[PDB]
From a paper:
Among them, the heteromeric amino acid transporters (HATs) are unique members composed of two subunits, the light chain (SLC7) and the heavy chain (SLC3), linked by a conserved disulfide bridge. The light chain consists of 12 transmembrane helices and belongs to the amino acid‐polyamine‐organocation transporter (APC) superfamily. − amino‐acid transporter (SLC7A11, also named xCT) is a Na+‐independent electroneutral exchange system for cystine/glutamate.
As wild‐type xCT‐CD98hc displayed poor stability and could not be purified to homogeneity, we applied a consensus mutagenesis approach to xCT. The consensus mutated construct exhibited increased stability as compared to the wild‐type, and enabled the cryoelectron microscopy (cryo‐EM) map to be obtained at 6.2 Å resolution by single‐particle analysis. TM1 and TM6 are apart from the substrate translocation pathway and create the cytoplasmic open cavity, similar to those in LAT1 structures, indicating that our structure captures an inward‐open state of xCTcons. The ten TMs represent the common architecture of the APC superfamily consisting of three subdomains, hash, bundle, and arms. The cryo‐EM densities of the hash domain, characterized by the four helices arranged as a ‘hash’ character, are clearly resolved [Figure 5(a)]. The indistinct electron density suggests the structural flexibility of this domain. Notably, the current cryo‐EM density clearly showed the existence of a C‐terminal helix running parallel to the membrane, which was not visible in our previous structure of LAT1‐CD98hc, but detected in another study [Figure 3(a), 3(b)]. In the current case, xCTcons contains mutations of 20.2% residues over the whole protein, including the putative substrate binding pocket.
Author numbering:
A (entry chain B): 45 to 498
B (entry chain A): 163 to 631
The structure:
Amino acid sequence: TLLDGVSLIVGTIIGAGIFVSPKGVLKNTGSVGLSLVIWAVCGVLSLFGALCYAELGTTIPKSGGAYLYILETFGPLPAFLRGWNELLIIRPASTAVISLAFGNYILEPFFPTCEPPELAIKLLAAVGILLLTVLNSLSVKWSARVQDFFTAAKLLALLIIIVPGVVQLIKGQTQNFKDAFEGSDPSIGGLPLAFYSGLYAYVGWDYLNFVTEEVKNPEKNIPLAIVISMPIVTVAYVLTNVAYFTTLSPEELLLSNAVAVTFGERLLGNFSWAVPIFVALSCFGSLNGSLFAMSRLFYVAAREGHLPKILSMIHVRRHTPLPALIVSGPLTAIMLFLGDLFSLINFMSFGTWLFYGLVVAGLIYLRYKKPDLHRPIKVPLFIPILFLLTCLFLVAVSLYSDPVNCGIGFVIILTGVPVYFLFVYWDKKPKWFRRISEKITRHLQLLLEVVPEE
Amino acid sequence: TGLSKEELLKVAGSPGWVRTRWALLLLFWLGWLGMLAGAVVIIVRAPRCRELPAQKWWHTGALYRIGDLQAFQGHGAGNLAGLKGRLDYLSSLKVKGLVLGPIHKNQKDDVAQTDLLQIDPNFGSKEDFDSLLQSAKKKSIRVILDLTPNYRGENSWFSTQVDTVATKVKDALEFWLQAGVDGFQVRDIENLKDASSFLAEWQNITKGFSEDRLLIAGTNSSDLQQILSLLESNKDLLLTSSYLSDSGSTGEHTKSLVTQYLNATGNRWCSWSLSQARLLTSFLPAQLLRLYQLMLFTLPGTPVFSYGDEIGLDAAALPGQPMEAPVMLWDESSFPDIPGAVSANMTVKGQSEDPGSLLSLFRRLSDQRSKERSLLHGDFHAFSAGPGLFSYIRHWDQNERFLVVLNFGDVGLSAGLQASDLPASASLPAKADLLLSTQPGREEGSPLELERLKLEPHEGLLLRFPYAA
């Protein structure tokens, strides 16, 4: 089921910043062909990451350890350095950016003369998130069907941009906009968020690699699925860019808005129907995905024994991990409050580069000392090494680019560590604390209507 | 313990938490709904950005006039291939289009022989011009044909009967439609049997052909009110006029001249040219010329020049060619009539090298207008300023603000900017991002403090601001 695995990662993960990253690489570069190639490079890096994740899966299949395997190589403490921090950082930042992108899309058809100010973009986005946690709290299988509805519309959301782009391609707009170009930069300029941003659009696959390891197929063939799927993504990126340079002009892409709407404005007839809520539906699918990712990981932390089981668990009425969803609410709300999409991206930028850096660092180390990683595909350490090298250099430059949010993000990452000590390795938890924690959680469960993580 | 036992919770399971939770739930989605309502009313209460008021061809970009093919090409051959090469030059200029000179069989003061339709073969065949027009379209160039039926002769309107050719105009509208020409330049009106009716007529005929096809109402008259009456009959055309040459070399006068133009124009389609169709480079010298280039371009309207204007082609000052039959010395190489007495600064090549040249000044200027939606369309508010200081607050027809400050003549003037004459909609920031300036040493790109702005000899200042309204 390798091609199944491919659809499970390309029909799922993709376009988180598809209407963000255009200007996210254009305003961050100047070429502009090389900024499209950024999207290509982003894909290449995700290839490398995924291949490394596959190697890790075969190296240590043990616990299921989507990253717990690197803990098995680095120890337990790094869990919060890694996972908890992703929960702090990436999950809700991406949730926020996506839902804010949603809000942006939603404003603009009713404001189609200029990019609208902070309005429903944040308020509605929050409302939407809360709605989605309600939908998720409704017996998960329903939210899954709702996500299926998202997902089909999502894989129309791509097409409502790309296919019109193809029409323009057929017209020959590529030649009309052939003045976009590529070159070379001896000084090696650019800006890391741009370099992030394609990866931002397609990230999460990273862990779905372990899902494909788990999925009924030879583990030796999941690299093949990986190799197949990555160029599909870069093709989609190119096709997306085609639409952006054959329907839209380079200048229109600099209008700082949900270019889906601007794109729609360039289409004939009732273009609101040409570029409909599929964008919103796309967002919602990915938003629920991140909400479930968070709630799932909250469950996992409880299973690790680091987190109180009350923050999962049903909620018999629906049989869903509402407490976990409840935690994810505020977690995303504050990221929505932050708003600024690229600073939200800065936080994600570190997190990814550094965390995936840990994955490949482990495999590099192990190959040098304590090898037998059980490579499912005949690839060298230059896959994890070159990946690592891009990613850390991007860390350094991005730090320089925005040492405020970059500094903060890094600090948050560091403060995964002492938190781990609070959750595990703490000096002494008070008895009365335990007593009231039981009393309080009892009351909370009495409110909830419940079955605890068994 | 961080969790209570299920069976313990079933001991237990009182309404005090069960119904309470239900109440809390009601409150939960109630609050959610309140938030939802907030999200709705905040966009209901939110204003909407100005719905971007814009015309095509009118009040936009720029156009340049072609008469003789040889002249235009700095030729020589005077062929259509040379013109086609110059179409790429045009695109480097970022000009919207051009006015094809009187290609049709113009006569030596003969209204009967004149073909406004049929092409004079001593420019080429229709098919040659069709491929020309096609390549122009491929290069995003709009072409307008100057229908002066007696171009070959003395009086462009024969100094006699014009109804014969009036019919031929109509017929030519179709002949040249078939060729592919979206408009026709019209000259001196003073010699026409109520051209205002003819232009209303023909323009509407051309309107039938396309919204679109634009005739150009040029005149050698300076009577703004006659010009107005021409506009009363026909708003729809592009105007050029000696009225605008009334500017002379006086700055505040010209400022009011502009105001007057706009007053008569009202809210009609705007256009700018100091002359009907004369090299403005032959009319006035670099000092003021380069300032007028910028100025006119930066006035509400479609600025229209003649070819040679962007190269500083003062044919009146160039042995080998008269103002009346100039040669566009755009090349090194294009000087047979004045061999070696003209530098590369006349040519586009040395002018490309020279960032302050009319060529490069214009190119930069047009580069900016292609992006500046406000330069394209907005209210260039009459900002008053000291003697020789032109100034305007460009109110983008949405939300972005610009300031024109033009130091007319070679005088070391101070800012001299009356900020106090502005309405709230004009209000204006002090950080004048310098877009363009005609004495190139000035910090282009810098947020020039207006209240500490020093002006220099022949110094235009196209400035950029956020929309402090």
